[PDB]
Amino acid sequence: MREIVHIQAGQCGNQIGAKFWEVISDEHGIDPTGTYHGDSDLQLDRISVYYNEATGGKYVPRAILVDLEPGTMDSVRSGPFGQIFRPDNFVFGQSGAGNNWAKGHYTEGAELVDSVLDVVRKEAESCDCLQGFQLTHSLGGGTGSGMGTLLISKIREEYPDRIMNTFSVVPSPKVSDTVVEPYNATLSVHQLVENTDETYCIDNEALYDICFRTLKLTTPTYGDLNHLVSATMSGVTTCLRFPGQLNADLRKLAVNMVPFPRLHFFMPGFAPLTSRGSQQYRALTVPELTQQVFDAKNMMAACDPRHGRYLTVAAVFRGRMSMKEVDEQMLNVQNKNSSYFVEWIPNNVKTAVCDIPPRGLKMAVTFIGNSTAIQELFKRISEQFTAMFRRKAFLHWYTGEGMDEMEFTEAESNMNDLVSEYQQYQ
Amino acid sequence: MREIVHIQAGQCGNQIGAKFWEVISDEHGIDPTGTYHGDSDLQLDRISVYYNEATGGKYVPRAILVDLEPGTMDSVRSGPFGQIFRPDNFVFGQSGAGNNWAKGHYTEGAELVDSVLDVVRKEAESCDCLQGFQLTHSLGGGTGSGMGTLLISKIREEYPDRIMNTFSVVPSPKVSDTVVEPYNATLSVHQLVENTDETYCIDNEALYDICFRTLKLTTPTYGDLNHLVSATMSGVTTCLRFPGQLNADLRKLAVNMVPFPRLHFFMPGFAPLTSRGSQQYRALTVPELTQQVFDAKNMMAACDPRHGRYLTVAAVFRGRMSMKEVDEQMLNVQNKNSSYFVEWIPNNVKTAVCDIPPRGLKMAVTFIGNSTAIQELFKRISEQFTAMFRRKAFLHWYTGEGMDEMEFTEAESNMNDLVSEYQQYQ
Amino acid sequence: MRECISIHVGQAGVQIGNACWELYCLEHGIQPDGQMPDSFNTFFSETGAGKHVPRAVFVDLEPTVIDEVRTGTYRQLFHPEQLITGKEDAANNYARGHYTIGKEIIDLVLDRIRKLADQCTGLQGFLVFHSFGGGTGSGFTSLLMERLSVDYGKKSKLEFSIYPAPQVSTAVVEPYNSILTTHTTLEHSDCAFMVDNEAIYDICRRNLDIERPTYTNLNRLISQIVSSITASLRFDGALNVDLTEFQTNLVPYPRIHFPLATYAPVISAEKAYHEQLSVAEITNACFEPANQMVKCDPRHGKYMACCLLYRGDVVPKDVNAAIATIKTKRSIQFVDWCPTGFKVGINYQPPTVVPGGDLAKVQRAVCMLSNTTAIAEAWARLDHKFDLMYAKRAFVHWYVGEGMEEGEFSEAREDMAALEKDYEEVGV
Numbered sequence A, B: 001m002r003e004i005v006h007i008q009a010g011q012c013g014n015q016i017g018a019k020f021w022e023v024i025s026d027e028h029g030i031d032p033t034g035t036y037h038g039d040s041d042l043q044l045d046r047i048s049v050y051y052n053e054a055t056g057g058k059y060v061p062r063a064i065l066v067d068l069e070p071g072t073m074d075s076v077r078s079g080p081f082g083q084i085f086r087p088d089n090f091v092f093g094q095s096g097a098g099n100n101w102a103k104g105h106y107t108e109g110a111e112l113v114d115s116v117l118d119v120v121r122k123e124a125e126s127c128d129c130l131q132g133f134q135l136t137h138s139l140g141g142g143t144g145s146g147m148g149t150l151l152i153s154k155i156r157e158e159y160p161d162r163i164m165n166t167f168s169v170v171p172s173p174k175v176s177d178t179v180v181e182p183y184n185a186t187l188s189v190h191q192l193v194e195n196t197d198e199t200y201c202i203d204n205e206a207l208y209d210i211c212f213r214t215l216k217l218t219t220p221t222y223g224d225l226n227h228l229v230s231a232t233m234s235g236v237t238t239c240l241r242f243p244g245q246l247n248a249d250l251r252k253l254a255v256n257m258v259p260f261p262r263l264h265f266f267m268p269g270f271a272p273l274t275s276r277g278s279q280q281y282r283a284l285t286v287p288e289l290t291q292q293v294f295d296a297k298n299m300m301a302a303c304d305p306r307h308g309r310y311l312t313v314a315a316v317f318r319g320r321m322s323m324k325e326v327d328e329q330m331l332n333v334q335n336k337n338s339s340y341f342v343e344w345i346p347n348n349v350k351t352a353v354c355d356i357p358p359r360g361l362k363m364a365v366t367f368i369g370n371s372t373a374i375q376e377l378f379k380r381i382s383e384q385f386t387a388m389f390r391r392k393a394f395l396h397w398y399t400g401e402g403m404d405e406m407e408f409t410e411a412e413s414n415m416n417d418l419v420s421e422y423q424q425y426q
Numbered sequence C: 001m002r003e004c005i006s007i008h009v010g011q012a013g014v015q016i017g018n019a020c021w022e023l024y025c026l027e028h029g030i031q032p033d034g035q036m037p038d039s040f041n042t043f044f045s046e047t048g049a050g051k052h053v054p055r056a057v058f059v060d061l062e063p064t065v066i067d068e069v070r071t072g073t074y075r076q077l078f079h080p081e082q083l084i085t086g087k088e089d090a091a092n093n094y095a096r097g098h099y100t101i102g103k104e105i106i107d108l109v110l111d112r113i114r115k116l117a118d119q120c121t122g123l124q125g126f127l128v129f130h131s132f133g134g135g136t137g138s139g140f141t142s143l144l145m146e147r148l149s150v151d152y153g154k155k156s157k158l159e160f161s162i163y164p165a166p167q168v169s170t171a172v173v174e175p176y177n178s179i180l181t182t183h184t185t186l187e188h189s190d191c192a193f194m195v196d197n198e199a200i201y202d203i204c205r206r207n208l209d210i211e212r213p214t215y216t217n218l219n220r221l222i223s224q225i226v227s228s229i230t231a232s233l234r235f236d237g238a239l240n241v242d243l244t245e246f247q248t249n250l251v252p253y254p255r256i257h258f259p260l261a262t263y264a265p266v267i268s269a270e271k272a273y274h275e276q277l278s279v280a281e282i283t284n285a286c287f288e289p290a291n292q293m294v295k296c297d298p299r300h301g302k303y304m305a306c307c308l309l310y311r312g313d314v315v316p317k318d319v320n321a322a323i324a325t326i327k328t329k330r331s332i333q334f335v336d337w338c339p340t341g342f343k344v345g346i347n348y349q350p351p352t353v354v355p356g357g358d359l360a361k362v363q364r365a366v367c368m369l370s371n372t373t374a375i376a377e378a379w380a381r382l383d384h385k386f387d388l389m390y391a392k393r394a395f396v397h398w399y400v401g402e403g404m405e406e407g408e409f410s411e412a413r414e415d416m417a418a419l420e421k422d423y424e425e426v427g428v
């Protein structure tokens, strides 16, 4: 009962999934072949939500892997828990986007999507009652953006009554991978406004910061980042997969943290984050967990959260905790930061508690916030777009796929409007 | 309940802390890892005031270590009980003052302070009810003076209702380390007048004297000095950390020994001080302890105390003592020295008794006095400043950081005024 | 049927109180557990079946002195509802205890008091132990005293206060503290008894032959004295002196209600064998200038009234003789308007002695609480001390910081001055 099939796209998204899946397997106790070796009985009662029980007791991941080139799918098979995945579910093309959303969304992706649109249906049929789809991709390039975007809107025609999650990675100003980020972002966001129910905007610039100072890691890699990001995902859907004193599923969360139709972009956060040095000396108790969580530099979105107010705020705690300890801390925080919470929505807090913790750690906190400080993330992008679009630069790649210069300004306008919605209520 | 976070600064202050912390650990029974090995149960009931109880029974020091260079922090880690300190709390810059208060207070220190101003807040939050901050630094150079001074005033904005201690080391005429002592002292003292509640003025010239004659040590080092100085610190806060027949905390002491707003500079003293020879033959009884304590040459401030009168006088005794023995001695002393106590504040004495002594010694006495003989310490400094400032010598280092020649005379005037306040009531 | 509520304020009150409690326990044959292996009904209430809890409330602004009781031998005698604890201390200041910190704790305690007070039926009166020189013992007490006149009023109150010494005093700002806290004492407190540490010390040295006394020796001494007040209630002698009766007797005027105590005999274990303790001798001992509890001069003073309370082996036949003898003597003298000036109490029960006690086990004992013009001179020097301190605004800024207006000082000094003349007026 209550199943969620997972979708993946892009070079980064796929990688994230690869780690995320592994982590989830570890949490339940699934091995590379698929046979169960775990001891705790409650891992097997909600195994059905993320694993179909196949023949011979070998569980399989309910997933769809998409790409416009075959390069990334090579390393996913050879790595750990690549053998658990079903051969049928891998989808891939021979062309590739080439860091262009125009090629990705119309010409290249629309030929590949019809295979996936048939594959997902089967998955849907398989489970008793599907409650929502998780989606993992990037907005920086053309492959993860153009394809995923194309897909997500066509799901709303067949399944209008289901919740829609999207785990994205938006561009940073300092750590700029590609040149045409402003373009891709500007166009890819447009469709994610009306079609999605919730979106987690992650940024690598913040991740790096988190890594250097807090974890004290001398040589970070992308692997670390993947591990981090996956943790967040694990956190949000913990209440479905395990019992608890106060359970909070996805729909509930959505209802609580999305007050208005067009303002649903969130910012993830994770705690506790401890190095080898801070593992010994940091006293892991609820208050400690709390304070760390609300720090500006501990966020995964590279902004200044204290420029504006949080519209809503929710948290998902794990491991056994006393509720007077838990529920008081939030209140205290609110009291402290009376200038950093919206006044006309009194009592902004939402809490959730799980009995089964992460293996090794005693407690954990996943922070999902909704703020007016997302303006800083978009504003810069808008500016960049303006700078680019003024001279019609890098345009012949997009215009070659049959896109008018008006069609840029149509999405641009929408983006602007969206941005304004935050500054309406700030 | 009732916690005190410790701050450190400068090359000397840090060193002092390093020893002080060790001594305090020894007193309670904390080991290099942090796990408790002690036997006496009363060490664990007031452990909370100087040690946060972290995970796994490993206690950690509530401290902040500050410096403008990374050199001094190397030897603190490698020494004894360097492993007890938390990695998070160490703060350090890459620039350095260069024995200049102008560079230290405005340009160099103000960039570093914003890290500490965030770190202290966390510490404050952690404890239930903080009662005051201890601070350890020097006024001779620019690093310990400029930074600490900068810090201490900004604490009064956030925490106006808390007691403020400062353990300084003022310059001597004979043992002159740097050339620009008069300058630094003149400017650093100005801010310590209005911002502090109490200050202990220590001088190395007296320490040396104490060492050569009393302790009969053939080869003194700075280590010995550190050990000595730390003892005083241990003495003042003994009543908080252990039970007693007549307890006296910091606030009480402050109330008793600071009659007027601007006259709060004290002079520390310690007893009994015994060599290997005098350990056997000196009869350690209360009267003996008393007489030694009031000697002019036994003080830590290099002055002549008998030039003027003590405005107030307090003492903190340790170990079990009969009160008729204790309270009589002081009275007797007063009777004897009727020309060396102020007449219009009759009954100048304050006493405090602790049941838990220092390990090894049977009894101990910490002498905190307030006198008009602090004029001799400042007068010389003033003279030196005058000598220097007449020809505008060593000025281009200070003027380079944007300080007018009027700004020297503004502080100078204040200093003069302060000096006069002693000669008003002498 | 009869009952009385004890209150303990500040560190001093706590410290004193423990000893008293111990003494009480010893008296009625109760171990620290609270189960006895009637007379004790006044101070102890029997909970369920064999659990004797005391009529007590310990107030303190620190945790140190109260947690001393919670960890020791008498952990079983009390529970955390009875033992109230603050956070920030009084810090040897009247202003901190009364205005700033005093609002929060008093509220908690009043309810507790009510809970304790309404449980018992026969309320005789209150007892409040503190020190004038102490921070909590001055600032809180004044507040507390003020509060207690609202709920009760006519129901009696007593307080055994540690008066400051001119020579041997262990704090600098004590003068101020005394002057302020006496403003509330005159209006609210029905009769306050006064003891000085210096006086005690001399006694300890000379008679007990212990040249190294500490607070534990003084506390014990005090406890005996305290017992000697309440001994009439708990035991049935041939003649009895209740608290109300005592009040009626000793206190003549509205302004004057400051008698001083004395206790005798107090002697060593070896000295008891030689010294034949007679009644007359013990009577004399109470009137000697050496054995007084306050630094005073009985030679200058005149006794308006004084209440003798005997316990042990005593009968009225020689008591009368003793009384007569004192009257006959002219070294002791009275005021013209009071021809008959004694109130005499008797008790069969002998005064107990503590395990490892400094005092010797004796048959007889006496306690005289004398109202006199001797203690009138004691504040003349206090005022002088205070005045000098005030004259140059010494230590004032701290007080000001805690919300004390400057006119308060003016109010308290003038009043004190006025009071000093009252004694003179009475004694003319």
Ligand SMILES: Nc1nc2c(ncn2[C@@H]2O[C@H](COP(=O)(O)CP(=O)(O)OP(=O)(O)O)[C@@H](O)[C@H]2O)c(=O)[nH]1
Residues within 6 Å of the ligand: A010, A011, A012, A013, A015, A097, A098, A099, A100, A138, A140, A141, A142, A143, A144, A145, A169, A171, A175, A176, A177, A178, A204, A222, A223, A225, A226, A229
């Ligand atoms: N957290 C992680 N972020 C990554 C990783 N690899 C890339 N990135 C970030 O994602 C951005 C690039 O995303 P993609 O390579 O997936 C662009 P896309 O695949 O959609 O198009 P093509 O590259 O044309 O196939 C870039 O700004 C990086 O900072 C990774 O392994 N982990």
Ligand SMILES: Nc1nc2c(ncn2[C@@H]2O[C@H](COP(=O)(O)CP(=O)(O)OP(=O)(O)O)[C@@H](O)[C@H]2O)c(=O)[nH]1
Residues within 6 Å of the ligand: B010, B011, B012, B013, B015, B097, B098, B099, B100, B138, B140, B141, B142, B143, B144, B145, B169, B171, B175, B176, B177, B178, B204, B222, B223, B225, B226, B229
């Ligand atoms: N008691 C001690 N006194 C010391 C010690 N080291 C130096 N000193 C005294 O302190 C004075 C120098 O103080 P500092 O070196 O801390 C000057 P500061 O660090 O604030 O500036 P920089 O040297 O430019 O970093 C000098 O007059 C010495 O007599 C020590 O280990 N113990």
Ligand SMILES: Nc1nc2c(ncn2[C@@H]2O[C@H](COP(=O)(O)OP(=O)(O)OP(=O)(O)O)[C@@H](O)[C@H]2O)c(=O)[nH]1
Residues within 6 Å of the ligand: B245, B246, B247, B252, C009, C010, C011, C012, C013, C015, C016, C061, C062, C089, C090, C091, C092, C093, C131, C133, C134, C135, C136, C137, C138, C162, C169, C170, C171, C197, C215, C216, C218, C219
């Ligand atoms: N006789 C006697 N006197 C005491 C004792 N303890 C304290 N004192 C006296 O009381 C005065 C100090 O008052 P405290 O009770 O310590 O002060 P406080 O009211 O508790 O205020 P804080 O100390 O700030 O909590 C001194 O002058 C002492 O001489 C005791 O056990 N016996």
Ligand SMILES: [Mg+2]
Residues within 6 Å of the ligand: A010, A011, A067, A068, A069, A143
């Ligand atoms: Mg790709």
Ligand SMILES: [Mg+2]
Residues within 6 Å of the ligand: B010, B011, B069, B143
């Ligand atoms: Mg230095």
Ligand SMILES: [Mg+2]
Residues within 6 Å of the ligand: B247, C010, C011, C062, C089
């Ligand atoms: Mg106290």
